[PDB]
Structure 1
Amino acid sequence: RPTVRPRNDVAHKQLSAFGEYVAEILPKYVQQVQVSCFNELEICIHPDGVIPVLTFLRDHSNAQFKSLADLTAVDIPTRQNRFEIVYNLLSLRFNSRIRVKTYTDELTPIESSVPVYKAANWYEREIWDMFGVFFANHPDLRRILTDYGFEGHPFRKDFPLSGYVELRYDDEVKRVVAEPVELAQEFRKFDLNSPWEAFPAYRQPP
């Protein structure tokens, strides 16, 4: 079928088998395992298990996920633990990828994974900067992307797109100053969602 993405059952079965393998070996930490219809494996864990689970996947002979592809956060305000912490890992030995997910809120530290991957250093600084998730035992946790003295965590869903302050050069004080934001043209919010359901397969129970 020319327009439809072909399925890959063989990879789906392999990744499912490995997902059970991980769950059996680390029952203390694994809460959910799932494989998407495009064959990506996700391990959902208790936050206490960040270091043991990541170490296992890096070092175990049947895993060897030696490369941390990416580390990021997602803000979901409706959840009690609004922040989802996503680790994307790559195994060159087995030419495979795995995603490890955990959660935290605004006041609960997550264990820094710099001991497992040195790559994690800056990714965790960015998560702290943009989302305000604190990582315990980080060698140097501080803002990385925002301005010095910037207040707030911009990537949170309740942070306004245009922020609270804006900058200009003021001649009286002969320096750049920060003042409350005023826009000559307000950003125009669009309501795009169709009132008609698009995907029956994902309908939620009433």
Structure 2
Amino acid sequence: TRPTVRPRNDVAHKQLSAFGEYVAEILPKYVQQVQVSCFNELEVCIHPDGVIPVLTFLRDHTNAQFKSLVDLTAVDVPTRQNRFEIVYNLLSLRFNSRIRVKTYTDELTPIESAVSVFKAANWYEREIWDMFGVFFANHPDLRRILTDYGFEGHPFRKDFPLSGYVELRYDDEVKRVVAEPVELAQEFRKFDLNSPWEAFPVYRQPPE
């Protein structure tokens, strides 16, 4: 229960918890869950219409100066209609604390841009615009990062093939590089390594 096991830090869990109810007090209007795992990792909801007003508050001291948007990590789950799950990782430097505060959005919901508030999201912007289509409040430019020029796709939508539909090559008489239909050789020979028989009864969503 020790040589392999990583010890559970109850203390920080206690402090983060208590601060968690503290914040739960402070912004009832958007804050929801106050998740607190044994990893010492706190988490909190925000409604997307509540993106900016919460985040600004975060930067300003209460007992945690949530300075430096370290990340706007993003996840797409097709099942939920609110398929997008934008996440604000954060770190109050003065208090050496860390927190994860996320949201959700639909394909045509103009979620608020923290560009005015953090500016670090001038690109967390355009990536998460481009890879997805998560339209953003008001940004100086929504021009694509990463993906090419005429490129139409939105990879990381967890949709359409990992190769994509596009596969460019130089061509002769046109004297120029041209995009072409894929035609993969050998093909990504995907292995379904999923295991029937649950190893974790403690979890397990009920059949209901």
TM range (shorter): over 0.9
Provide the C-alpha distance between the structure 1 equivalents of 2:25 and 2:130, rounded to a whole number of angstroms: 35
Superimposed CA distance per residue, residues 9-63 of structure 1 (whole angstroms, 9 cap, x where no aligned partner): 0011111111111111111111222012211111111111111111111112311
In the alignment, is the contact (CA less than 8 A) between 1:84 and 1:101 conserved in 2? Answer: yes
Provide the C-alpha distance between the structure 2 equivalents of 1:177 and 1:18, rounded to a whole number of angstroms: 57
Query: Does 2:13 align with 1:32?
Result: no
Structure 1 gap ranges (5+): none
Percent of pairs with identical residues: 96
Provide the C-alpha distance between the structure 2 equivalents of 1:95 and 1:154, rounded to a whole number of angstroms: 35
TM-score with structure 1 setting the length: 0.97
Structure 2 gap ranges (5+): none
SS at match of 1:68: coil
In the alignment, is the contact (CA less than 8 A) between 1:70 and 1:89 conserved in 2? Answer: yes
2:153 is aligned to: 152
Q: How many residues are paired up?
A: 206
In the alignment, is the contact (CA less than 8 A) between 2:35 and 2:42 conserved in 1? Answer: yes
In the alignment, is the contact (CA less than 8 A) between 1:169 and 1:176 conserved in 2? Answer: yes
Report the CA distance between 1:205 and its aligned residue. 1.4
Report the CA distance between 1:125 and its aligned residue. 0.9
Provide the C-alpha distance between the structure 2 equivalents of 1:159 and 1:97, rounded to a whole number of angstroms: 35
SS at match of 1:39: coil
Ranges of 4+ aligned residues in structure 1 off by more than 4 Å? none
Report the CA distance between 1:159 and its aligned residue. 2.5
In the alignment, is the contact (CA less than 8 A) between 1:71 and 1:86 conserved in 2? Answer: yes
Report the CA distance between 1:118 and its aligned residue. 1.5
In the alignment, is the contact (CA less than 8 A) between 2:10 and 2:38 conserved in 1? Answer: no
Provide the C-alpha distance between the structure 2 equivalents of 1:129 and 1:18, rounded to a whole number of angstroms: 36
SS at match of 1:89: strand
In the alignment, is the contact (CA less than 8 A) between 1:125 and 1:143 conserved in 2? Answer: yes
SS at match of 1:124: helix
